[PDB]
Amino acid sequence: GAMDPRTITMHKDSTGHVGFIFKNGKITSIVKDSSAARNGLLTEHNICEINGQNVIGLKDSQIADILSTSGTVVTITIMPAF
């Protein structure tokens, strides 16, 4: 629910992308018509886990690298914040 973590499974498109951008670990925009959009990834939520790995505290370059090098399945657990 509103306060709670949610886990979203996405699949990469033909160029290896799932459909979002982020900054300082927070998702900031979803790409229209993407896997992220279809599967309900949310903006203003922090990236907690990717493919079951906790990434809290990692810098953006590392989160980016994990996303870019992932296989086609990308599962992300996200968390709201105030």
Which sign, positive or negative, has the C-alpha torsion 13, 61, 82, 29?
negative
Taking CB under 6 A as the criterion, which residues in 63-82 touch ligand O? Answer: 77
Binding residues: 24, 59-60
48 touching ligand O, by CB under 6 A: yes
49 touching ligand O, by CB under 6 A: yes
Query: Which amino acid belongs to residue 49?
Result: E
Q: Which one, 13 or 49, has the nearer CB to ligand O?
A: 49
Binding-site member from 54, 62, 68, 72 for ligand O (CB under 6 A): 54
What φ, ψ does residue 60 adopt, rounded to 5°?
-60, -35
